[PDB]
């Protein structure tokens, strides 16, 4: 419905293990009660949900692949278990539910490159 802006880095490298952590900051209209954050994979011109979490108070964000906690405007995200096939464009989608109204923010994408040893 109503929209807000989501910023995230364009390119992120993995570690040898498969650690790809980035920051997803959203231009919040204000301080919200329920915020649902979602990570989306555009690897093959197709969308696949990866993370999915929601918190109904201040900074109590607790997510499987995704380890990460939220700090106000910025959610600190980490993705484990990345193979070279996991390479793709990851979109951080932020939904703030309550209080009304509904604000939706779609990030341009974080291209994560993963190789394997």
């Amino acid at each position, epitope marked *: 419905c109503k929209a807000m*802006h989501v910023a995230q880095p364009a390119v992120v490298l993995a570690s040898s293990r498969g650690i790809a952590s980035f920051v997803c*900051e959203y*231009a*919040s*209209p*204000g*301080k*919200a*009660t329920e915020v649902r954050v979602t990570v989306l994979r555009q690897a093959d011109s197709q969308v696949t949900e990866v993370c999915a979490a929601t918190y109904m108070m201040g900074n109590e964000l607790t997510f499987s692949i995704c380890t990460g906690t939220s*700090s*106000g*405007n*910025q959610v600190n995200l980490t993705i484990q278990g990345l193979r070279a096939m996991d390479t793709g464009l990851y979109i951080c989608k932020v939904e703030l539910m309550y*209080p*009304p*109204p509904y604000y939706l923010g779609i990030g341009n994408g974080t291209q994560i490159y993963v190789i394997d040893p």
Partner: antibody, heavy 118, light 107 residues
Framework: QVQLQESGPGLVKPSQTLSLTCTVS?????????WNWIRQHPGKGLEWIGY???????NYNPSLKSRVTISRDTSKNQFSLKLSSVTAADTAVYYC???????????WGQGTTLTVSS | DIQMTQSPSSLSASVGDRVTITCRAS??????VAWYQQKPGKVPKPLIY???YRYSGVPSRFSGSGSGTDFTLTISSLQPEDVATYFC?????????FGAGTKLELK
């Protein structure tokens, strides 16, 4: 687009009850946002009086909790301020502004000017 | 409450300069700070929200900076239309508090 228009008396004698109405158009109070009242003293900063939400919920500044009542008329799309036992310290320019829950003031009314004089 | 101390109280500047207005929060508020432009005899107009994002329609010369307790509003290239009074504002903890205001003079 969302428009807010203040309305009220020019002057208020001391110890009266102050009444202003903020007529909102192009958006409905009951849908979702928090609707605030703000005054600005001559020569000082901006003071936040309080709000009323879509939910009917109220919160007022602890400085002005006892002297302030903010009420709304759902049919007319208005939310009004009631400030009682006024003093000369209440001479200010009064604004009504839209807000998200603890957020930036998305829209403002033109603001109305009120003088506490005898 | 939470006190937002705004500096400078009033400044003088010529067109083309770069002016910075500071607003020091007595307590940490994170990124929940906004900047508003009140023109002389006019309505306040929101410029900066979330401490770094321009309101829809704000020219690019306006930029918001700051982290934690210190916040700055920056005009890259000053213009005649920008002569106004600028206010900072928190939205992390009720009650909401503004700054004392900073006034712009054309030198």
């Amino acid at each position: 687009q969302v428009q807010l228009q203040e309305s009220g008396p020019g002057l208020v004698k001391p110890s009266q009850t102050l009444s202003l109405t903020c007529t909102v158009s192009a958006y409905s109070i009951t849908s979702g946002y928090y609707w605030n009242w703000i005054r600005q003293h001559p020569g000082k900063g901006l003071e936040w009086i309080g709000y009323i939400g879509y939910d009917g919920s109220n919160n007022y500044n602890p400085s002005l909790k006892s002297r302030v009542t903010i009420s709304r008329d759902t049919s007319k799309n208005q939310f009004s301020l009631k400030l009682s036992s006024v003093t000369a310290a209440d001479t200010a320019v009064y604004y009504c502004a839209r807000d998200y829950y603890s957020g930036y003031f998305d829209s403002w009314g033109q603001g109305t000017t009120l003088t506490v004089s005898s | 409450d939470i006190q937002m101390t705004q500096s400078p109280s009033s400044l003088s500047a010529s067109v083309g300069d770069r002016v910075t207005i500071t607003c020091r929060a007595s307590q940490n508020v994170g990124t929940y700070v906004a900047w508003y432009q009140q023109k002389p005899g006019k309505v306040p107009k929101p410029l900066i929200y979330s401490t770094s994002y321009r309101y829809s329609g704000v020219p690019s010369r306006f930029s918001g900076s700051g982290s934690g307790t210190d916040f700055t509003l920056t005009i890259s290239s000053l213009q005649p239309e920008d002569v106004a009074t600028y206010f900072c504002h928190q939205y992390d903890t009720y009650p909401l508090t503004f700054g004392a205001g900073t006034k712009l003079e054309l030198k």
